[model samples]
Target: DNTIQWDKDADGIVTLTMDDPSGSTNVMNEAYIESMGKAVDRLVAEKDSITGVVVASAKKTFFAGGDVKTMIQARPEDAGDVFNTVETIKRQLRTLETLGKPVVAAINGAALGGGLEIALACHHRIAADVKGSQLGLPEVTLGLLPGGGGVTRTVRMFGIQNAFVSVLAQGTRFKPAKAKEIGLVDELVATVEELVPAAKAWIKEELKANPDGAGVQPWDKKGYKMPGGTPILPSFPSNLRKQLKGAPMPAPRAILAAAVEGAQVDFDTASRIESRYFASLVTGQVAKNMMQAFFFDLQAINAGGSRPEGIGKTPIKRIGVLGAGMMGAGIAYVSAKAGYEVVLKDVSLEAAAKGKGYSEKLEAKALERGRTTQERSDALLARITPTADAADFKGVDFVIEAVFENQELKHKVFGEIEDIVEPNAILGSNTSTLPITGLATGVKRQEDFIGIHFFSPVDKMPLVEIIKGEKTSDEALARVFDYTLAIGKTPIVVNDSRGFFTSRVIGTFVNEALAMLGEGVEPASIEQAGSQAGYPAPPLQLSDELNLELMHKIAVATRKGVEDAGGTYQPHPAEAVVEKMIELGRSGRLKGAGFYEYADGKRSGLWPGLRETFKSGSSQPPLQDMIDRMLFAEALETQKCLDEGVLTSTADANIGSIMGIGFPPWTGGSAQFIVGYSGPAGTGKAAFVARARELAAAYGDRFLPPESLLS
Candidate 1:
């Protein structure tokens, strides 16, 4: 059924355009790919005039990578099948690359992951130079790789180190200028008018010279030289280790190995290696557990990727922060900076002054880093009113109680506030572990109470865990979310659970490290492993900074919760060491004595006696093992939370760890960390499950994948 065209001119040019059939962004989906594949077959039937092909999308964003909803919607057993489907698409790219004429990619706007990979398959690429236009392979963020041969293609095009940075470290679309500099894009122009012309010029130029080179591509060359110096095995030196100084996962090495190894081998072998590693990663305990905990589970709890449904976006004009502690001052300063008039109250004028000192220091730091001008800092600082009287908080829209962890003290103070503050003003507690639902028991309007959990030394933390209690109204939740976002902190909406998610998950990591120490592993070994495994802070240092006593309290609480849930109440072996330390009059960093003893009664230093503590002759486990163990334990706990509906979205969970705690950034946060390390296409959940089982066997049930997560 021919509509037109009989290869008349015989110039052999075919243009394949990508425009969402529905007039929106051309999102890559099963249906879109199927339609595109079918269209390609029809073009092939009329191949007489199709000497060259060009791919252009009608939408501003060439392609928005793969559909995310589809990822969560797929069946577990169908995981591998999904990957196979992606591989089949990759094969189509191979066909496009080997077509009888030079194929050109006229990139009009942002092209990422599969879109970029599709561009790479073209013999030549021409991209727009618009301010925000970009090209990249950012599949890692979704816990998936470019099943369209992105890992190997990137390395083959841009050298190994460059590829690692592009693929693993910076998982976002590159700027037009940056893409040109890295040779990721062939030509860059200012407008769409010049895009097709530049592409056609390249086609004519390549055809004029060795016309034979027009059809055959470099990747198709039997002995094709990698675009840059081929860095293989030992000779394959990479700056990844240096570049990823504070990454959350050990991905630079993994990504480098995958890209380098995948490039050198044949396509099938490379795919297998990439897929196997990817499979092993996705099904690995870390990937599966983290994916469930951070992705699906976190998303559902966060009100389906948008603001909580029932919350009204109320305008907040005035804010009040209770306690002039470091946390309070930071909150006050941040709120004031966001243009909200803030009242910061402390127990005494002197204490309030001392707490506000941190805020001043923060401003100084900001000015030092060129983030703010001295005059601006002064203006912002003036907005924060510090006083010792609760009377100053009367007209505030929200009251953030950042007092001590003592519930009795909080109850007394908030009880006073409830009487003074206007009705409808939200009451938020900055307590890290105490439940908000419990804190609201004495409040007149329980609907107005919420939990705003901020990290220590608050001025530097970028994440605020917004805990929505059972009785907390949607208006309260939405207000906090908007307020936190306004203050430049990522807000993760979690159900009312003690410790919330970040504090709870991170607590397990620290506790497990101590348990390793008690099992005869040296402090240095635990610290080394923690560092190697991608923790921003070493285990010993984190233990000291976070407080060992706090760790013990959390471990005990978690154990109790588990026992209450009908699970075994087995204590981590680290409890014994903590108990022993308590016996020796050493408690934690607060006491100036613990893993590393503090001195001068103010700053904690490493205890010189740690050499004697682990005299039991058990060598330290591998550093990777420690990292694996710590992350694995946290992943398991998070999975339990997900299975139980504590977290709302994986994206939130990933970003939360980044902002809430100093979870490493290079691994694309926790969710991406699990995806890249778990397996190919991140579809092999079983492979990740198997790896987790192995870890569980080596460790304890802490690494075990939750049965509910199997769904």
Candidate 2:
């Protein structure tokens, strides 16, 4: 009885207030769904007394979408229940809309996913022009489509073409203004105080204006063609883009298919089509993997799951970035944008200035494209001070060294700057390969040493791998975690080891394709196998972009370190191909050659010399074998990481792989990929392990699954 309230005015206007007691924000959860069912039944039973209905929330926001936590736990066999759940909720929405009474959604705040679907089911939607209001169908971002009558209603409301661009594109959350401009919301009021009042007026006016047709939806009316027109899909490019790349893009294509196909059907049948797509996505491996990583795992990271508890927020004021290269420049820019005063340092003043100019160049482009104003751009630039002097580290709360990967120079910078910055200020290294324990020796405070490794082109990359040295204190880890969160980056905590989690596992990813090339696989075929397996970029092309010379250096360092430690360096087959690539003058894409030929600084085609130079006399393995090797190599490497204590959390293991290393989005990640991957005859981790053994006997021992991963 407390879940929802029914109130009516003398004018016979019914106000359905959703006031769930179980949650802070209203959601399309079980309690509300049941409550809505009862209230809607009552709403229909007394339809003659109710002139119209005004749907609103008593909570701060409208709804937090469907309970993904509940849905994500469903197994493949649960597709029937998943379908029933979505269909039931959508049935209530359908009932409410077609009740022959004018209905309105008094959207108080954000209306996303199923929430927006509810609003779409209303005859009219009036949202408050409040700060932080959002309206969009972002279910696709979480490997889902709008199943709560969203697809059926949106196409009916905005037409196929407009809905594709506005809602189905990227799951982008449009603000109140943009939603209004695009006709998503019918009207906007100045404040929450006016929302219900405006809805009442609209309901009465709409009823008076069209007594017979006021409550009928566009698609429910006779002779209704879609707003613009029916969708006409292209035939040729559909195969090339949708067939080859659609492996990783099922959600996009699924929603697109639903929109186009649903638009041609009757309203009720289209609603069922939306439900079928939602159920398939909920129970499928791809959506399960994505929900695990992008939703649950990402939520864990955002909630500080990896951080040490009981430590207060880190008070970072002035920051010092040592190195003016691309990495350093990006760090300084993001820091400045985060409102921290940044000192961008390098070998000389001019070098540092150019580094700072990277920010200027970005802001200038933003200005040219009307993304920012000159005043704000100038303010951001002023926050960064370019300098060559180590003394500029004075009074800085934190110092992050983005210097070259050479250990000597990183040690040198640490030794020189430890005395300049505040004595208690934590020092961090941005090294991708070197261990923080070895680098900690240069500093007086070993417990304060940390690794704050960032991916290239830091302005766009969202991940920051926080490495804890053996001697690093919990407080140090907590403070670094805080700093990363403050700068708006997802942090995955991992114990210090060679290559850490991402670098170690991603090495196996790129190297697996290289190994196939060594196996006499055609260069084009090798690259094609990777794309079909759903990697972000083909291995050969990615290796070339990452620079073959750098790969060779890392390999040498790895070999040297392992031998120096009295352990055997098990050379991956990828190592030999890397050396061969380097043996030629071809270095990387920047050098105009590597795995592929270049024309005027763009990739032209695969180097024709590669086949003749690295050809094999033996017959090639089946394309399926090549794909299995590429996918299993990464998951197997991740298992080794967990076995060796490099990665303790599967959440970090999965998140780091996808967010940090460009693992295929559809697979979940290197770690979670195994938990659900289909084998030759079965499914799940056990099936995956069995398939790996088969791959090992056929291809090489590298495919052998570690015994530790079975659990």
Candidate 3:
């Protein structure tokens, strides 16, 4: 009689609401479990008289899935513990959805990961019309699945193909409309005010004198069938494997197996089967490796702590691009496409016209893919304004200087732009290796200067490295973040240094691979090994793809830096080979020859000229060890960046490497690989370090671990 009151009017209308105790977002943890469990108990006790329950979070964010920190910290090394955790959580979720009481999830905002899973467990779901509000299970990014039964429940509720794709991808937070379209959220209202009325109405529809045996989900219904009946399921046929090759995890075969058998069984049996798969992934190498890799990736993305406090976040309505070549044109195209008014200027008006060609191609591709209407394409192209003079830089809020990577040239461009644009406007360089501070020495308002380093083919890549020079103001920093987000790409803040963070680390990896090849390892094998280890591209292959000349240039720069720092520098073994190639006008894929010969857009394996480069020597080691060696060099460099205060958070490091440069998403990124080696049960760490030391000994001293790693 004294417990939490529900019947104010005693009219048999009841709502069960969750007001998270300490915050705006409801996180599903033990405390939440305790409160909700008690609430469910009391509500069920009064179910005879009460009509419905509205599950809403008092917090701004909906449930953030079951407590991942809790499960991950449990460190369930064995099967029994894993089973118990999943089984217990499964019981709670099952109770919430099927306890014979009409339940509605009043999703206010971002019911992600486990929160989405909990919402999926409810009988009905409603959400706000806010554009950014979304639902998804990002557990896979952490190398886990929706262990709280979302994977199992999603398969049952949404069907097989959608569930597998969304779960495996681990991203997608749809807004109210998109959620409703996907059948995840039942209704999308205009405001939070209408949630209760919607909930009661939905409850009226769901309530029945004779319910489907108390707790019947769509999949739990007797004669229920999966949508499309499992296209890749084993029951279908064995011929669909090639169609699903891009998934890269568990194989289509395994997923099809999980889906077909799970669908045929009852709810509880299907859930149990899904749990086994979830547990296997969570505890297995792929899951752990993927989670660790993600941590690295997120770190690289945030570039941890590089951004200072008190930065102003303002949208850049207009963008000025100073280069007209591939890099500059690509930048102009993407910026305009993302809705920024663009002014592209080069040495001459004719040169500036080249950027329009870039925009045309992008628009054409979008049209080809049916991604944009012809009118939309025309509107986007109309936004691009090209000129040779600094006069067109007027009213631009952000200026990106993509001129040649020369100190004097970059400084001159920045100086001219500073005079033309608003004093508060951001001045950014597209240089990959030069330090921003050194570049900004010629600018009077150095605080307004920053580095906006983009990977090549900028239109395709999703990452933009925003480097903060010594005098870079917070206003400048926040402006770049806002602009980058506006341009639909991820921005990582990193302190200025030679090559900033990513290029430096990746350059080291590439150089080390080339050095190893010079030591007599086959060039083709060297690149192939890195990719097999889950690298987006093999270090050597990436070098060859980018051009061996750039590889050689980076190696020379690194060796010079090492020598300048009083460390021994060894010339790469492939130096003579590259010199001869350069002399013969060969570089890499760009030049149509390097490690491979390019013919009619096709690439042939290692050039026969390699035999002339050097005679083969000692037997080479396995590719795994070589991959470890290359990643170790990268991890070692990233560690030094962390120690030097360039990287402020693990999230930045992890995200930047994984997304920015395609450092494997599976291992998270380079630092994750290191922290992994530093952690217990990492055989690769010590072995990697030892191999690095051995390589440095055999080749050069650049592979030595910086004291930061030891520290």
Best by lDDT: 2
Order by TM-score, highest first? 2, 3, 1
Better TM-score candidate (1, 2): 2
Quantify all predictions' global Cα lDDT against the true fold: 0.71, 0.85, 0.71
Candidate 1 local lDDT, residue 288: 41
RMSD of each: 6.9, 2.1, 4.4
Tens-digit lDDT track of model 2 for 418-518: 99899778898898788999999989999998999998898999999999999999998998899888888899898999888877887888888888788
lDDT (Cα, tens digit) per residue for candidate 1, span 1-711: 211122222355666777666547666677777766776666667666576777887778777676655654555566587667666677677777776778898899988877888888887888888776767876555455565677767766666666776555557668878888877887778899888767766777788795877868666676777767654243344443553332343333456567777776766677666654444344333434334544454554344364666555689877888886757877877787777888878888888887778888878888889997888888888878888877787888799998888788888888888878878799998888888888888688899899998876676687788888899988788888888778876678889887788887787777788778777777777877777766678767776667666666766777788989988777767778777776777676777777776677664556767767766348656666677787767666766777677876567766666656656554435554455354332434466576677778887877878785476
Candidate 1 vs. true structure, TM-score: 0.71
Per-residue lDDT value at 508 in model 3: 67
* Candidate 3 local lDDT, 608-668, one digit each (tens): 8775564444538766667667767777788888888787766677777777767765555
C-alpha-based local distance difference test score of model 3: 0.71
